[PDB]
Each structure stands twice: as C-alpha cells, then as structure tokens.
Design a protein around this ligand. Structure first.
Ligand SMILES: [Mg+2]
Ligand SMILES: [Mg+2]
Ligand SMILES: [Mg+2]
Ligand SMILES: [Mg+2]
Length: 263
RNA sequence: ACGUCUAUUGGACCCGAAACCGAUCGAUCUAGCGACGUGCAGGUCUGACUUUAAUCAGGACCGAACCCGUGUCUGUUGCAAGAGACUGGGAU
C-alpha cells in the first residue's frame, strides 16, 4: 500500500533494496537551515557523562548536533495571533516542528519553534488561552478541551510546559472530569490524573509516516549517532554472564495519580 | 658466671617464585569519543532536477594516491623482536 509522502527507493543495489524514506514534498517547506538565533551548535556527547565514562551505550558519531529552542509552554505567547511561516524537520525529534511568527503591537516581530499538529499548512494562525478556539494547534486548559478529542503536549505541574504525548503521531484522550483530577488516557493505554490548570495543545502530532520509514542499511542509522550493539551471549563471563521484573521505584509520590498502568 | 652444643622468637645458613594489598605514572603505541581542518587521478553503469545552462544521489562497478593484509615463496641471531616480491580486499 503506497503511502503518499514516502520516497520508495528502487532496489538498485543491496542497502537501497529495502529502504523507505520520508518525502520532503509532503513537507514542502522543510528547506532551509535552522534559524540563526532560534538554534545553536552544541558539541556531541558520545554517551559520556561529566566523569567522561560511558553511561548510555551504543551512541556516538554522525552529523553535527544542532539544538533548537522549542517552546513547550506557549506561556508568553498567550492571546497573540501567531501565523505559521513554515514547517521544519529536526533530526533530534521524531515529530517535526512548526516555525511561528508573532507580531505584537509594541514590539518588533519574532519567531518561535513549537511542535506541529496535523492541521498546520504554513498559513494557519495559532491562538493560546482560556478563550481559544477548538481548531488544532491551539493551547487550551484541560477544563476548556472536550471529552474524547485527541490532545498532545500535556503538562503535569502547571507552568512547566508540555511533557506528555509529544512524539511523532501520538495523542492523549481525556475520558473523565474529576474537579481537580481529570482522568486522561496517556498513549501507553495508561490512565493518569492531570490537574485542570495544566494545558493541552489540541490536535494530533504529525509525522505519522515515522512508523513506515525504513533505514535500509547500517550506515544510514549509524550516521544518526547510533553505534552498533553487541549481543550478551557473544562474550566471556567477566564482560557479561551469557557465554520478568518490574523496575519502577515502589513507594513513589506519583502512585496517587494513576488508575491503571501501561496496557 | 664464662666456654661449647642444641632449642624458641625474630629475615635467622644462603639464593629462587608464581603471588596478595595500597597509591604513583601512563590514551606520543593502541580502543572508543569529542572539536577544528584536509584528501579521495582516471573512467563505467543506474535514478532524479534543470536545460541556450560549469547539478545532485548509490554503505554502486573497474581502477592509481591512500587504508588493509588473502594465498604462495624468500627470510628465521632476518633487511625487519613480524619484513620483502608477486598475487590480492576496500577506495564518496
Ligand atoms: Mg651460658
Ligand atoms: Mg593520563
Ligand atoms: Mg590493489
Ligand atoms: Mg575484484
């Protein structure tokens, strides 16, 4: 079944034989480097902490890391009409961002990066507040969003920004409205109670094609900063003992907010 | 008490381990990572863009610079405490 926005690489040689890549014609305005003041150039880490030893394994190498200042709260852009100039594709996240230009009355116009919902066309105007619309890309309080409409970029403690349901093609659903709790189904089929003063970016995150993508060769996934793994049974007993246990911290403070676990 | 001979504690007739415990120095060899910079002759095939036009992709192919070391032979206090010759593998 050919999806429209995927480049189906022809089997010319092994490696590009079973390779599927996302077309940048579906996202027509990705073209352009990251904005020169919304982005910096930070050194890559390689998986090593401040000591210098490896903490996370199988990481390192690849393209120069560029970091983008994505605004996950939209607190200081409340009540401001922001017209989306273009959509951008960052390699650091599964879902892609959306460049938004805000023109306030007393200040010169500026640009901000926010996560892109499914209904951004590089022409839409986004609005955030108590009185905002129900069209996708609006940030509303959990009280102002309906029951059963998909939402994303959810906060846990108000004023912190959006931390929940923000990967590619993911969304959360509000199913109940307890006065201070508001039971919400997180994308792992887990119900969590999120305070009503928290905010939800209404809509659904883009990059649904993320599941259908296929790096056909080791190099294309190695060039993303992923060094090769090694199986446990391929070693001597000193390195690994080769050749069903729940690991969440029990007696935590967040047991009170969850009704069912990740199903 | 002195002298001699044994005995015990001491390293205790002498020489000889593999060791164990601490805390110095070493990534100028080598393994990984990170920052900056540089290099890849000549051709061949396939796909795409634009064409009055001095553009891109493929862990593509043959092949020098370059990287590695498959087989055989030489060498074995050797030219070399791991080299040489000819075949080889990769070379956007
Ligand atoms: Mg005596
Ligand atoms: Mg040192
Ligand atoms: Mg050769
Ligand atoms: Mg050959």
């Amino acid at each position: 079944a050919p999806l429209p926005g995927l480049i189906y690489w022809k089997p010319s040689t092994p490696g590009t034989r079973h390779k599927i890549s996302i077309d940048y014609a579906g996202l027509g305005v990705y073209t352009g480097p990251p904005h020169p003041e919304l982005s910096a150039h930070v050194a890559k880490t390689g998986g090593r902490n401040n000591t210098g030893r490896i903490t996370t394994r199988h990481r390192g190498g690849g393209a120069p890391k560029v970091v983008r200042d994505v605004d996950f709260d939209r607190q200081r852009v409340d009540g401001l009409p922001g017209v989306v100039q273009r959509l951008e594709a960052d390699p650091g996240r599964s879902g892609w961002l959306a460049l938004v230009k805000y023109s306030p009355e007393g200040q010169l116009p500026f640009y901000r990066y926010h996560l892109a919902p499914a209904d951004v066309k590089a022409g839409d105007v986004l609005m955030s507040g108590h009185g905002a619309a129900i069209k996708p890309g609006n940030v509303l309080t959990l009280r102002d969003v309906p029951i059963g409409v998909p939402i994303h970029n959810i906060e846990l403690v108000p004023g912190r920004g959006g931390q929940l349901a923000r990967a590619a093609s993911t969304s959360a659903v509000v199913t109940s409205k307890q006065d201070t709790h508001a039971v919400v189904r997180l994308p792992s089929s887990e119900t969590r109670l999120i305070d009503l003063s928290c905010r939800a970016t209404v809509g659904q995150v883009s990059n649904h094609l993320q599941r259908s993508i296929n790096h056909g060769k080791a190099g294309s996934r190695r060039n993303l900063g992923w060094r090769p793994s090694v199986r446990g049974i391929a070693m001597n007993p000193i390195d690994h003992p080769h050749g069903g246990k729940r690991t969440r911290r029990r007696d935590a403070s967040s047991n009170k907010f969850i009704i069912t676990r990740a199903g």
